[PDB]
Symmetry: C4
Subunit: 33 residues, 4 copies
Amino acid sequence: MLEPFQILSISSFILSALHFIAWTIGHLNQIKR
Amino acid sequence: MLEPFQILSISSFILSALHFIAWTIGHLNQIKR
Amino acid sequence: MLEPFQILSISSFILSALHFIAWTIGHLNQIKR
Amino acid sequence: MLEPFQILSISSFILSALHFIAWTIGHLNQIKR
């Protein structure tokens, strides 16, 4: 744990914020053009 | 009921549902427009 | 199906698969033309 | 290493990269048409 686990929880957190913004842009972009 | 980690489980709950409804809307629209 | 903890891992798990499939079909539709 | 929930965290890891890598590829479809 910690080396192979804590690195998963945090890694995923970085992606969560990444997809969160990539979603508002690609989603909002659809209804905008 | 931790704090730095409990915010990950809850944060994921808000995103999990947002994606569930967002997927049903953008996916359904994909098979129509 | 335990408290908001195990019931969350399962809920999300069911979504992980749903998104995986919808991705192979919705993505393939893109490379259809 | 755990065992029951173990394989669960792993599966999620595969999707974490599958989404980030797929996003970089499918995103181009948006800026291409």
